Ligand binder design. Structure first.
Ligand SMILES: Nc1[nH]nc2cc(-c3cncc(Cl)c3N3CCC4(CCNC4=O)CC3)ccc12
Lengths: 331, 266
């Protein structure tokens, strides 16, 4: 490589350490790498950013796909890539996102330990639906939707805005659609919609609807049938075409679940089966993926026209009682 | 088919459709060493190296096209002496292969493809073996991704060409030739200057004239700037005259020796 070109680039290259203060501000460590709550050293910007050093070196398939997609996606309810820093000496990649103080895992947990207000649940569901509709319209599947990935913005100019995160760019099964558990070989839009149905139930009751003790997972299916009932042939005609259909027939009898229904489960948790909430939830939690509602159809549901209307800020101008993210050690 | 209808909000459109004057302004540094003629001949040559690398690696045409767009973007901005284009060609194919969901082409398979393609199919240009190893590809990848500002998703004319020929009801008659003509457009700067759908309309038009198919009414019924389409047809007709008059195999050793060389360290 030409020497003049090399030094000019090394002179002018923005380095993550020079632009951002993140010493001792680690908020996450996982398989993804390390994430910090960072502020600009320059001072002109006052906002916090989420600063991720990706795990490993170089540019893996998953890193490449994540950078490639996040570089194109632009929507209020999907968390957006602000900048990429490439550190050449060590071949480490840093991604800068907008910082979300909260998420549904921590919010639901705060209420499970004081009911989760029903205006907030509607507003959360709508913004989740809006974000996934945008992704689905661009043929981008999430592939692992759950409360941990549904981030919510804290105080600032995007207060109470849902931000979808951690799309599948390239254990617990509580949010997995029954076709996945019966051996379906491909992720679909419908699989994301089932997961959204599970989250909505959990937001209404504070309990994961298909909670189960830790492709074919018998106990997870048992919990879906204890909640939903066992599907009649008429409800899911192509269930016979699922790879694990005979295993299902071997292990399960429909007789076992004859007193089970979504209506009975939700009634136990003080959600009326005549409510628009419930009718929407039942459309999202349809066992047959081809009979499941789409994100667009769900957004048009009359649930969202019923008092109270959804709000842009899911906290509705009220005080945020949820605690800020804990700092972690560098160990 | 990720991001397939997002072109008008895409990084390709908003950042990587360049003005022709800026392109030819940045190119003047390399035009001290090479003539205009020799520069377009280099572009043809390195397009063919990249096609041969993809063919050897059994990659789909879309992945080859994306790799070719990367290579062109780099040298639209920087001189040919910045990084050896012999290094850059396989780097672009490696990076494009990771984007397009085929695979992280094996390190040993990327290098073997590079070595064998230059020995077997380009010995007239390259008498010495491919001198680079995987650590050189890996360094280059970081430079390439930085210059492209991490813009990895590239739109091509293939998809809209297929939609247009289906609307005509002339897939079997016109598609093969229109498709090969879209492949040929990558020998030129077009992919940096016009949106892909306009390139597909130009290639389809040239295919209709070559095969003597009257499509005047269909083209009349489109809501498009035909002055822009005629500019593209004019470049497509020019490239076949350039093709006729160019012997890559006789000329390329001499042209490559005239390329500006990198400065070493002090
Ligand atoms: N301890 C933690 N629990 N949940 C967390 C979420 C964040 C977070 C905040 N704002 C913005 C983004 Cl983008 C965030 N992240 C972190 C990085 C992640 C988590 C999975 N893979 C990722 O790349 C995507 C969401 C940080 C700390 C958190």
């Amino acid at each position: 490589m030409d020497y003049d070109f090399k030094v000019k680039l090394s002179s002018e290259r923005e380095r993550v350490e020079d632009l951002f203060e993140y010493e001792g501000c680690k908020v996450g460590r996982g398989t993804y790498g390390h994430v910090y709550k960072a502020k600009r050293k320059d001072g002109k910007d006052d906002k916090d950013y989420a600063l991720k050093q990706i795990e490993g070196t170089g540019i893996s398939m998953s890193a490449c796909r994540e950078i490639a997609l996040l570089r194109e996606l632009k929507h209020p309810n999907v968390i957006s890539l602000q900048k990429v820093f490439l550190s050449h000496a060590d071949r480490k990649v840093w991604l800068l996102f907008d910082y979300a103080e909260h998420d549904l895992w921590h919010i639901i947990k705060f209420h499970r330990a004081v009911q989760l207000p029903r205006g907030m649940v509607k507003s959360l569901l709508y913004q989740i639906l809006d974000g996934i509709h945008y992704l689905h319209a661009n043929w981008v599947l999430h592939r692992d939707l759950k409360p941990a990935n549904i981030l919510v913005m804290g105080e600032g100019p995007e207060r109470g805005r849902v931000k979808i995160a951690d799309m599948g760019f390239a254990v617990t099964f509580w949010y997995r659609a029954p076709e996945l558990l019966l051996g379906a070989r491909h992720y679909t839009k419908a699989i994301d919609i089932w997961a959204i149905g599970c989250i909505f139930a959990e937001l209404l009751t504070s309990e994961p609807i298909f909670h189960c003790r830790q492709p074919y997972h018998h106990d997870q299916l048992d919990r879906i049938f204890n909640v939903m009932g066992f599907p009649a042939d008429k409800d899911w005609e192509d269930i016979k075409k699922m790879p694990e259909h005979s295993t299902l027939m071997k292990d399960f009898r429909r007789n076992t679940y004859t007193n089970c229904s979504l209506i009975k489960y939700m009634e136990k948790h003080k959600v009326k089966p005549d409510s628009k909430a419930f009718h929407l939830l039942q459309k999202l939690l349809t066992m047959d993926p081809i009979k499941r509602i789409t994100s667009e159809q769900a957004m048009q549901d009359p649930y969202f026209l019923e008092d109270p209307l959804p709000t842009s800020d899911v906290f509705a101008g009220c005080q945020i009682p949820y605690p800020k993210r804990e700092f972690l050690t560098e160990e | 088919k990720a991001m397939a209808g997002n072109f008008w909000q895409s990084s390709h459109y908003l950042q990587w459709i360049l003005d022709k004057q800026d392109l030819l302004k940045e190119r003047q540094k390399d035009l001290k060493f090479l003539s205009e003629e020799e520069y377009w001949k280099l572009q043809i040559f390195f397009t063919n190296v990249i096609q041969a690398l993809g063919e050897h690696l059994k990659l789909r045409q879309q992945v080859i096209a994306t790799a070719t767009v990367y290579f062109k973007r780099f040298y639209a901005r920087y001189s040919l002496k910045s990084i050896d284009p012999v290094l850059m060609a396989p780097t672009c194919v490696f990076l494009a292969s990771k984007v397009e969901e085929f695979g992280v082409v094996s390190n040993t398979r990327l290098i073997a493809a590079a070595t064998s393609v230059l020995k077997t199919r380009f010995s007239y240009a390259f008498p010495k073996e491919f001198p680079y190893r995987m650590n050189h590809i890996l360094e280059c990848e970081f430079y390439l991704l930085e210059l492209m500002d991490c813009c990895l998703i590239v739109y091509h004319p293939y998809r809209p060409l297929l939609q247009y020929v289906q609307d005509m009801g002339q897939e079997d008659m016109l598609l093969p030739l229109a498709w090969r003509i879209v492949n040929d457009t990558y020998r030129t700067d077009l992919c940096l200057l016009y949106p892909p759908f306009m390139i597909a309309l130009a290639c389809l038009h040239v295919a209709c004239v070559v095969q003597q198919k009257d499509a005047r009414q269909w083209f009349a019924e489109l809501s498009v700037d035909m002055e822009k389409i005629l500019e593209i047809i004019r470049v497509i007709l020019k490239l076949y005259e350039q093709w006729k008059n160019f012997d890559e195999r006789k000329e390329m050793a001499t042209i490559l020796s005239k390329m500006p060389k990198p400065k070493p360290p002090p």
